[PDB]
């Protein structure tokens, strides 16, 4: 509402892709890694998502608070898509977004900062995590 | 400064089945009958919006040309649905072109007082490929 205060107060920390996060959730049913996994995730102005996957999983962005996100989907990392992740319905943003199993992905805040939640079904797991080489983007 | 009736009456735009305005700019001679691709300049204003429907055979891809940018709604199965806003702003999560796959439903609206655009159509298309949804449908 003020980005440092929602990190303290969510307890947000560093995530290897960018941006500060918070596991609160790892389905204790669906083998070790559990039927889904639940995160908080925000990103400020600069500090932004690099380019990663889950290889494995599918990954649902949801928007809860500040400036609306810029959201880039690439299914085969030469092709790419891109969303405005935010609540203005009637501007052509989308507070709910699908990235499918194993399909590249970034984003960035296009405010100061962006509250996000990720779902991931079956639960996240760093073994099924990859992120792309420094400076890459789809096609390189 | 432009108006949508002096856009209308410049190109020769006439309404389209969908809703807006339009006019058909080419049809390759090479590639069969439908030729390898067309091309078409289209409308919309503020309230007259693109109504749902699909072309069954062919790619067809929006390209921003003036006006406010646009939210174009996908939805291949019918039900998943995706939207983009198509526009010149680059750093603001918009992308002056997208790519709506083979008879995937589409539907579009201005965000502003009016939108030219620019539709290319791969192979080709041909009214008999347009298929539109009843009026009120929605994916689901």
């Keep these: 509402m003020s980005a440092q205060a929602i990190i303290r107060e969510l307890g947000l920390e560093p995530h290897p892709e960018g941006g500060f996060y918070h596991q609160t959730f790892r389905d204790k049913a669906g083998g070790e890694r559990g039927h889904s996994t639940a995160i908080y995730y925000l990103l400020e102005k600069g500090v932004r998502s690099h380019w990663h996957r889950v290889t494995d999983a ?3 962005w949801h928007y ?3 400036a609306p ?3 880039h989907l690439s ?3 030469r092709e790419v898509q891109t ?3 935010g609540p203005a319905i009637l501007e052509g943003e989308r507070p709910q977004v699908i990235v499918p199993a194993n399909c590249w ?3 960035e805040s296009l405010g100061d900062f962006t509250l996000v939640g ?3 079904s079956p ?3 760093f073994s099924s995590f990859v992120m792309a080489e420094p400076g890459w983007s789809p096609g390189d």
């Design 123 to 125: 639960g996240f797991a």
């Design 75 to 77: 299914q085969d990392g």
């Design 69 to 71: 996100i810029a959201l």
């Design 58 to 60: 599918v990954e649902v």
């Design 83 to 85: 969303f405005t992740l």
């Design 118 to 120: 990720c779902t991931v």
């Design 64 to 66: 809860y608070a500040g």
């Design 105 to 107: 992905q970034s984003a």
